[PDB]
Amino acid sequence: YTRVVWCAVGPEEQKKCQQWSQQSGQNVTCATASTTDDCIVLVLKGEADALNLDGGYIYTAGKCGLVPVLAENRKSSKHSSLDCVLRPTEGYLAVAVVKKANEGLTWNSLKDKKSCHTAVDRTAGWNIPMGLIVNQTGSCAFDEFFSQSCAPGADPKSRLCALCAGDDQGLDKCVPNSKEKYYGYTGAFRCLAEDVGDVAFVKNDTVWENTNGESTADWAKNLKREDFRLLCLDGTRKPVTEAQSCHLAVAPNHAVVSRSDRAAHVEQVLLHQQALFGKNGKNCPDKFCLFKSETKNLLFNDNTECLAKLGGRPTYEEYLGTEYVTAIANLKKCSLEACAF
Numbered sequence: 001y002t003r004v005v006w007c008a009v010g011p012e013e014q015k016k017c018q019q020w021s022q023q024s025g026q027n028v029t030c031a032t033a034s035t036t037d038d039c040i041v042l043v044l045k046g047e048a049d050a051l052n053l054d055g056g057y058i059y060t061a062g063k064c065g066l067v068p069v070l071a072e073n074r075k076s077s078k079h080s081s082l083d084c085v086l087r088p089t090e091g092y093l094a095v096a097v098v099k100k101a102n103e104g105l106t107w108n109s110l111k112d113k114k115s116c117h118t119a120v121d122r123t124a125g126w127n128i129p130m131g132l133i134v135n136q137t138g139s140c141a142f143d144e145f146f147s148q149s150c151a152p153g154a155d156p157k158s159r160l161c162a163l164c165a166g167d168d169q170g171l172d173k174c175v176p177n178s179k180e181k182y183y184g185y186t187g188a189f190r191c192l193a194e195d196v197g198d199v200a201f202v203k204n205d206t207v208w209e210n211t212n213g214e215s216t217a218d219w220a221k222n223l224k225r226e227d228f229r230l231l232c233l234d235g236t237r238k239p240v241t242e243a244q245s246c247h248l249a250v251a252p253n254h255a256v257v258s259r260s261d262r263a264a265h266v267e268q269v270l271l272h273q274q275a276l277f278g279k280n281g282k283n284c285p286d287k288f289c290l291f292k293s294e295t296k297n298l299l300f301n302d303n304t305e306c307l308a309k310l311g312g313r314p315t316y317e318e319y320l321g322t323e324y325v326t327a328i329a330n331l332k333k334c335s336l337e338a339c340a341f
């Protein structure tokens with residue numbers, strides 16, 4: 001009965017979640033929805049207890065009263081001593097990526113180009129880039145900036161969805177879940193890698209994990225780090241090893257959210273679950289690995305070492321940071337006291 005109902009987004013996260021449930025002796029059970037927003041609603045209704053969310057969704061969930069519980073903690077070895085779970089999270093680097101061979105393409109020449117986004121409302125693939133575009137362009141017409149784009153979650157008949165491919169059967173075009181071929185970090189990077197788009201708004205870690213043999217996936221096997229360039233905000237182009245000096249912003253780590261009244265219980269269960277299926281987990285990579293899904297980032301990002309405790313008992317605004325929270329407000333004025341359901 002001290003069971004947590006996780007919310008899976010899409011049928012792939014659903015399959016993984018059921019695997020995790022089977023392996024957990026049903027201490028973790030699953031609910032599934034077609035979109036992250038839908039999953040947030042199941043949580044709000046009390047039909048689900050939690051899910052891991054990108055910062056852009058943390059904001060949406062936050063206005064509706066959901067709270068940050070644990071955050072993804074990546075592999076970084078500085079802040080050396082502390083165990084991952086107590087280690088402060090460092091946020092990730094949102095970057096704008098292009099093909100090297102696409103010479104001359106700079107932040108300054110993006111208008112009317114083809115773009116690849118993780119999804120609408122996500123931090124690196126949308127809020128940061130479009131916030132900057134809107135900032136600099138003076139206009140709220142961010143649907144008219146790129147000639148065509150794949151921005152999962154936008155209107156399927158609009159140009160913002162024109163580049164999306166849907167699933168293997170061409171169905172679910174532009175849906176904001178993994179069925180969409182160009183969804184999320186990897187999908188958006190694939191959109192760029194296959195030259196469907198001119199630029200991809202992902203994070204620094206995405207380019208590395210999908211190049212120089214790190215993938216084995218058909219589309220990425222032959223990808224070489226040198227064939228890509230990051231677009232700095234000053235107009236220059238740098239190699240992807242220069243992310244620390246050429247990025248659009250550092251994003252708050254994806255984090256697990258739940259209803260305030262269920263947070264403590266979710267925190268508790270989760271810590272026990274990762275001890276079992278986490279990075280050094282008791283049953284991983286033997287029975288089941290929570291943070292692994294063949295580089296598809298299902299439920300959690302695949303580069304997650306562990307889920308770490310937060311700190312000054314973070315409200316959702318403190319977790320995202322004032323800088324980021326203001327940015328989203330300024331961007332969504334284009335579409336404070338809110339929620340949306």
Ligand SMILES: *[C@@H]1O[C@H](CO)[C@@H](O[C@@H]2O[C@H](CO)[C@@H](O[C@@H]3O[C@H](CO)[C@@H](O)[C@H](O)[C@@H]3O)[C@H](O)[C@H]2NC(C)=O)[C@H](O)[C@H]1NC(C)=O
Pocket residue numbers: 127128131132135322323326327330
């Ligand atoms: C797009 O819209 C505006 C363009 O200026 C940006 O919003 C502004 O962001 C600044 C920087 O974070 C905010 O300044 C802050 O002010 C408080 C006190 O007012 C201060 O304590 C902080 O240290 C900081 O200086 C400013 O409030 C905010 N402007 C408005 C009208 O809300 C926004 O960041 C731009 N979007 C992106 C993604 O850059």
Ligand SMILES: CC(C)NC[C@@H](O)COc1ccc(CC(N)=O)cc1
Pocket residue numbers: 088089090310311312313314315318319
């Ligand atoms: C307003 C007062 C001072 N509270 C600040 C507070 O609760 C801040 O929250 C946080 C959240 C997350 C992080 C990142 C980190 N490295 O721990 C740092 C600080």
Ligand SMILES: *[C@@H]1O[C@H](CO)[C@@H](O)[C@H](O)[C@H]1NC(C)=O
Pocket residue numbers: 002023024025026027272
């Ligand atoms: C389920 O959770 C309980 C409560 O903490 C724990 O004692 C038990 O080991 C877990 N069962 C399985 C099969 O993991």
Ligand SMILES: [Fe+3]
Pocket residue numbers: 054055122123124251254
């Ligand atoms: Fe993200």
Ligand SMILES: [Zn+2]
Pocket residue numbers: 247249250
């Ligand atoms: Zn920076």
Ligand SMILES: [Zn+2]
Pocket residue numbers: 312313314315318
């Ligand atoms: Zn606080």
